[PDB]
Paper text:
In the present study, we evaluate the activity of nine anti-SARS-CoV-2 monoclonal antibodies (mAbs), previously isolated from convalescent donors infected with the Wuhan-Hu-1 strain, against the SARS-CoV-2 variants of concern (VOC) Alpha, Beta, Gamma, Delta and Omicron. To understand the basis of neutralization and escape at the atomic level, we used cryo electron microscopy (cryoEM) and X-ray crystallography to determine structures of the two mAbs: TAU-2303 and TAU-2212. To summarize, our study provides functional and atomic-level structural data on the interactions between naturally elicited antibodies and SARS-CoV-2 variants. Both TAU-2303 and TAU-2212 are potently neutralizing but arise through different B cell developmental programs.
CryoEM 3-dimensional (3D) classification of the particles revealed that TAU-2212 binds the spike trimer in five distinct conformations (1–5), with 20339, 15868, 14193, 72056, and 39788 particles, respectively. Conformation 4 of the TAU-2212:spike complex has all the RBDs in the “down” position with three TAU-2212 moieties binding near the junctions between the RBDs. Each Fab2212 binds and crosslinks two adjacent “down” RBDs (RBD1 and 2) with a buried surface of 823 Å2 on RBD1 and 298 Å2 on RBD2. Comparing the structures of the TAU-2212-bound and free spikes revealed that TAU-2212 binding induces conformational changes in the RBDs, producing an anti-clockwise rotation of 4.1° towards the symmetry axis, and resulting in a more compact RBD head structure after TAU-2212 binding. In addition, the RBD loops 454–462 and 468–489 that are disordered in free spikes are well ordered in the complex structure by forming three hydrogen bonds with the bound TAU-2212. The E484K mutation completely disrupts the hydrogen bonds between the antibody and the RBD, providing a structural explanation for the complete resistance of the Beta and Gamma VOCs to TAU-2212. Structural analysis of the bound Fabs indicated that the constant regions of the three bound Fabs in conformation 4 (three Fabs binding three “down” RBDs), are positioned at a small bending angle (14.6°) relative to the variable regions that are aligned with the z axis. In addition, the three molecules are well separated and the distances between the two C254s that form a disulfide bond and crosslink loops of the bound Fabs is ~21 Å, suggesting that the three bound Fabs belong to three different mAbs, rather than one mAb binding the trimer with both arms. Given that most particles are in conformation 4, and no spike trimers were observed with all “down” RBDs and a single bound TAU-2212, we can deduce that binding of a single TAU-2212 mAb to the down RBD trimer triggers a conformational change that promotes additional Fab binding.
Residue numbers in the entry:
A (entry chain A), F (entry chain E): 1 to 140, 152 to 225
B (entry chain H): 348 to 594
C (entry chain B), G (entry chain F): 2 to 215
D (entry chain J): 158 to 173, 188 to 210, 216 to 259, 263 to 396
E (entry chain C): 447 to 495
């Protein structure tokens, strides 16, 4: 039914501007308010504004006036948010949320923020994008090194050996790049039934490198 | 409720706002007979009855003062002098999730047509044929109560429709259901347009010596004209006489 | 701004837990449009109570809400393992400034889950990593609860805090937590020590794994 | 006092020698009229309304309760107690001519359909009749029986083959079938559930088995 | 299907014959007199198809 | 279009009670009468009763009064028949059948028993359920032994070698168990191109055993 | 009860065959709702004539029905190989006891199909069966018509009726019939005979297959 799709993860430098788009489906796009919210990593939730798909009326929070612009292309059913003069303190996750009905109705209630989207992970800093380095780990795993963007897709044997594979959270390094670990658990075995290959798919860097594990 | 055994709720002694219902977008139908929907906040009624039931989409047109068919004849009859409004809206997301039966039944067979605002619940077996079975069911003997088959998304016009009809009573005891109007001050010994909770006229109001019994509100002079009225806030007995006129 | 909400709430299984949310006169004392949302770790918030108590579909009858004065309460009784998620409070603000505000958040930690000793695995640098003129030791910790562990390295016999990266454990698929640690050393440093040990403390349970270059 | 509730109650009302009462159940209103006149005499008295009771139920039979000043409260005895007569009359749809005095109190009334003189008083709309001849109403000999005379045919003419035909015609070149000399039953068609539309113009669908036509197309 | 196809749900009073009414003014369908733009009980009359 | 599904095969002991359910689809379940009939193995047909989905009205035959109860759950469109005080003489096959229209109609006829179902094979006796024994037959076949329930699913090579396979009718033994034969016809061949494995799937006993044929 | 129907009817190809169904006054003399059904061997009955003669869809114009007095007739002319199925008669009974009744049934055997000598195959007990302290000889008969055969065992030279199981042949997919026979013997009995022979008689055609333990 109702489902909302955001834009891809945003990587930028301070002093620039970013645009966030929410494309909705499964419901009448001009029948409900569209809300924009922000959430810092590990902190509480915050509210940006809402947009009335019918005409383009915008309302902004007290602390987000001047650098927030609300627009939307209803022909393709997309809601746009424009953020100007980006700063490192705004590195967070942004959600598009559905409000109540834009029309008065007695058989309808007032369920605010009923449906949310996946969200866009915006990352702004002075660290440049670095091509990820992937190395294997011979069992007695797979690690990714030197990659500025956070989201990384990892698999094993071209996404075929999905058994016993667990993904560990990434740890940020002081140089701006990240580091993640992905290990397949095959204990009490000869480790020779099949050849183990770990795969990394870093879409922001557009890299796909396969490493053999022996 | 089902088409038969329709609900009947009595509403009295309230301030009734009808702009909330008319402004509702869900209502697909809001036909009003005998009254103007915009001119409903200015009136006053003694009793308001609300009847709620669910029917078939093609079957909504039968809910009218002078229509005929299965529903009008056998399930729900509206008098030809109806003074009220019918409110219906499509509800396919609440009465047709699975099967759609949901105990939604109606009456195909009956001996004779219904009287206005008359209910008829009966498990008696109808005999639509030659043989007088005089028992239960059998050939040419059928159970009148047939259930609605509300298959999920079976095409518009067969989907369940929830109908709520309001009947406005008039010409009775002092009105108890009135619109949201702010009463003004009382002006006497002056040609003014008065509006005593439904009774509208133009004239001059003066103190009257008429001795109304504690249960009389109005007063009719000769030729059946309203010449005396009771204020609905101070119970004062006021005399109404026409303003000066001549050739 | 926001609404004052208790920062930390702890609830044992089988009891009733109430979360407060204090607001102003024009925020909660006039508009009964307050709502409560449960935010799973790593997942977008899901609507729980759209207004004071009334609940949407897919919400159990256990949950309830109430309004009194300039504050609101969310009631949960008989906590379950799925309740270990963040909880938020929101309301609508009017009085010539139509906007909405959120709360300070609250962390709920449901007990009852048995404590498990953390599993520590050590992965030495691979041949590819050694050829890259760098050595990295990965200390992986999983299958433990609660997700509060401290990871440190003791080298041969002396603790070292150089090149040590430790992150807060995150919830796994089995309702447990996992943490990843990294130790970066030069090839000369790696070969200058007879072994390397990773020590993890988990509410008094210490697991030590010793690995050596030989 | 022995009573109960049975947990189906839907109304409640608590408030505060010749006694006369009228109980009328019309349009869901149970109106009660009362009068307390000190003293069946020959006088005239009007019954002021007492209570409206705007809920109302279906009522067909009724009872009466009696009490004692100071005796046992046994709930099972039938004749035990001290060793109160009341009258019952039935209302009828009669026409009355009421007389209101200067104070608005009904002082006298005349029953229209009681005597020829009463009919004359009702027609003149006055309580005093002068000498002369007055035309009051009309006289009609009411029918004593109802008879019906229909021709004897006793065969069902085929509405079935018109409707169950395997192939109807186009909009143009529409079929035209003549039906005559039969006993026609129209309740079979109206009772049919398939018929989505059954509009009738110039005739009532229920009043179709009582008529007679020369030709049906 | 929107294609700028809009209509008017809310208006203060009914129209006169052959009378047009274009307005971005915010309608107040509720108790609170917001007297501003939008908000609760205050709606934009122009609703799109 | 119209299709009716019965319950699974019933195995019971004398003196107990059984319930037979018919779930219909492809037509308005409350528009036609539902009929219950019985048929002894090798004998003529017999009639049990009919049920009017609208209210639950029941009519029973003269010889089946007292131990026959007719019910139905229209929300899921199922018709129920309850048989009490079961006896060994009632071991037969029961069918759910569709009658004429429950409503009067001139464009409809009176096609009784227009559509039937697969039927439920009820078996009642004092013989207990026995785990089937399966053995192969070396060509110059596959046999199943010691299985009280009648319906048995048989295949070859996990339902892959469906060529030349014929199923023979089962023969009842005096001990209450049955015996069936299933042979694959591969003549004028070396019998060595592929390994032949016969498979038995006895759902009432929940057994699946594969036997090699050499 | 039921309606009297002829038990056995035999019809050669190319002629007209009429099946009678005699009832009572209140069963057939007043209610013209009689019907006829064809029941294929092993398949649920399929509606053929819903009322006296009128036929449903998918029914050839060959079939016809009639009503006269207190009996009804079903007419078939030019029989085909598909007509070898059971036929049933039903009607509706009223007179203050609304119920329906069936007929006595009738078996129709269409001729014209050429007679084929039965094929007899003998399968000796396998190694697994021998290890189970039991010996079973399976005599399979197929590819014959009509499906009326007698299966007997003659051992070495003396017929034996101990442990012999024989069942009525059932129709195959090729419009022919097949029968299965079982002979159970102890290991001592199996080894005490130099051979075992299975004899099958099919309308005077005798097929004998001889197998020996050696
Ligand atoms: C009337 O009361 C009885 C129990 O006293 C129960 O059936 C129900 O509460 C009422 N019946 C209705 C509402 O039909
Ligand atoms: C009250 O119920 C009886 C029950 O048979 C009925 O005959 C009568 O018409 C009812 N009174 C009404 C509907 O006013
Ligand atoms: C009517 O009112 C006048 C006013 O004084 C009074 O004198 C008179 O007695 C009243 N009439 C009756 C019948 O009491």
């Amino acid at each position: 039914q109702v489902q909302l799709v955001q834009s891809g993860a945003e990587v930028k430098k301070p002093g620039a501007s970013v645009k966030v788009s929410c494309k909705a489906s499964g419901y009448t796009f001009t029948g409900y308010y569209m809300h924009w919210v922000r959430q810092a990593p590990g902190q509480g939730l915050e509210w940006m504004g809402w947009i009335n798909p019918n005409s383009g009326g915008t309302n902004y929070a007290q602390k987000f006036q001047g650098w927030v612009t609300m627009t939307r292309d209803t022909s393709i059913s997309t809601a746009y948010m424009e953020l100007s003069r980006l700063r490192s303190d705004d590195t967070a996750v942004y959600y598009c949320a559905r409000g109540w009905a834009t029309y008065y109705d007695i058989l309808t209630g007032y369920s605010l923020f009923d449906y949310w989207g996946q969200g866009t992970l915006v990352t702004v800093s002075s660290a440049s994008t670095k091509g990820p380095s992937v190395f294997p780990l011979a069992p007695s795993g797979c690690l990714v090194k030197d990659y500025f963007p956070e989201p990384v897709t990892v698999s094993w044997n071209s996404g075929a050996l999905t058994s016993g594979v667990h993904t560990f959270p990434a740890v940020l390094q002081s140089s701006g790049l990240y580091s993640l670990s992905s290990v397949v658990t095959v204990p009490s075995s000869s480790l020779g039934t099949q050849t183990y290959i770990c795969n990394v798919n870093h879409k922001p860097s557009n890299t796909k490198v396969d490493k053999r594990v022996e | 409720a089902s088409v038969y055994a329709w609900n009947r709720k009595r509403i009295s002694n309230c301030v009734a706002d009808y702009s909330v219902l008319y402004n509702s977008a869900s209502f697909s139908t809001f036909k009003c007979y005998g009254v103007s929907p915009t001119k409903l906040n200015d009136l006053c009624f003694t009793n308001v009855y609300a009847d709620s039931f669910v029917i078939r989409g093609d079957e909504v047109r039968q809910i009218a003062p002078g229509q005929t068919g299965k529903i009008a004849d056998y399930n729900y009859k509206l008098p030809d002098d109806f003074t009220g409004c019918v409110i219906a809206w499509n509800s396919n997301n609440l009465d047709s999730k699975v099967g759609g039966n949901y105990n939604y039944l109606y009456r195909l067979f009956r001996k004779s047509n219904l009287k206005p605002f008359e209910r008829d619940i009966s498990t008696e077996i109808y005999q639509a044929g030659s043989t007088p079975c005089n028992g239960v069911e059998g050939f040419n003997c059928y159970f009148p109560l047939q259930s609605y088959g509300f298959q999920p998304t079976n095409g518009v016009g067969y989907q369940p429709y929830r109908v709520v009809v309001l009947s406005f009573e008039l010409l009775h005891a002092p009105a108890t259901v009135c619109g949201p109007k702010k009463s003004t001050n009382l002006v006497k010994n002056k040609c003014v347009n008065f509006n005593f909770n439904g009774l509208t006229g133009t004239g001059v109001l003066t103190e009257s010596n008429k001795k109304f019994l504690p249960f009389q509100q109005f007063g009719r002079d000769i030729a059946d004209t309203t010449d005396a009225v009771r204020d609905p806030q101070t119970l004062e007995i006021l005399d109404i006489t026409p303003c000066s006129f001549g050739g | 701004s926001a609404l004052t909400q208790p920062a930390s709430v702890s609830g044992s299984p089988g009891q009733s837990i109430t979360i407060s949310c204090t607001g102003t006169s024009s925020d909660v004392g006039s508009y009964n449009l307050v709502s409560w949302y449960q935010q799973h770790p790593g997942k977008a918030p899901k609507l729980m109570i759209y207004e004071v108590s009334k609940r949407p579909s897919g919400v159990s009858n256990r949950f309830s809400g109430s309004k009194s004065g300039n504050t609101a309460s969310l009631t949960i009784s008989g906590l379950q393992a799925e309740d270990e998620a963040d909880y938020y409070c929101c309301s609508y603000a009017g009085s010539s400034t139509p906007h909405v505000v959120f709360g300070g958040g609250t962390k709920l930690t449901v007990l009852g889950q048995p404590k498990a000793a953390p599993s520590v695995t050590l992965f030495p640098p691979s041949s590819e990593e050694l050829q890259a003129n760098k050595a990295t030791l990965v200390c992986l910790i999983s299958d433990f609860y609660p997700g509060a562990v401290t990871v440190a390295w003791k080298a041969d016999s002396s603790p070292v805090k150089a090149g040590v990266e430790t992150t807060t454990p995150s919830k796994q698929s089995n309702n447990k937590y996992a943490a990843s640690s990294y130790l970066s050393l030069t090839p000369e440093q790696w070969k200058s020590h007879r072994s390397y040990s990773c020590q993890v403390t988990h509410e008094g349970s210490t697991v030590e794994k010793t690995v050596a270059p030989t | 006092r022995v009573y109960s509730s049975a947990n189906n109650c839907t109304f409640e009302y608590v408030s505060q020698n010749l006694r006369e009462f009228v109980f009328k159940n019309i349009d869901g209103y149970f109106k009660i009229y009362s009068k307390h006149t000190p003293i069946l005499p020959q006088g005239f008295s009007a019954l002021e309304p007492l209570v409206d009771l705007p809920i109302g139920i279906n009522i067909t039979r009724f009872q009466t309760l009696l009490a004692l000043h100071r005796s046992y409260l046994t709930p099972g005895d039938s004749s035990s107690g001290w060793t109160a007569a009341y009258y019952v009359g039935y209302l009828q749809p009669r026409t009355f001519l009421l007389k209101y005095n200067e104070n608005g109190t009904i002082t006298d009334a005349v029953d229209c359909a009681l005597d020829p003189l009463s009919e004359t008083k009702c027609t003149l709309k006055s309580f005093t009749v002068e000498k002369g001849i007055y035309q009051t109403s009309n006289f009609r000999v009411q029918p004593t029986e109802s008879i019906v005379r229909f021709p004897n045919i006793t065969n069902l003419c085929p509405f079935g083959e018109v409707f169950n035909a395997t192939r109807f015609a186009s909009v143009y070149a529409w079929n035209r079938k003549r039906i005559s000399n039969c006993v026609a039953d129209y309740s079979v068609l109206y009772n049919s559930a398939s018929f989505s539309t059954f509009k009738c113009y110039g005739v009532s669908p229920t009043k179709l088995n009582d008529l007679c036509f020369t030709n049906v197309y």
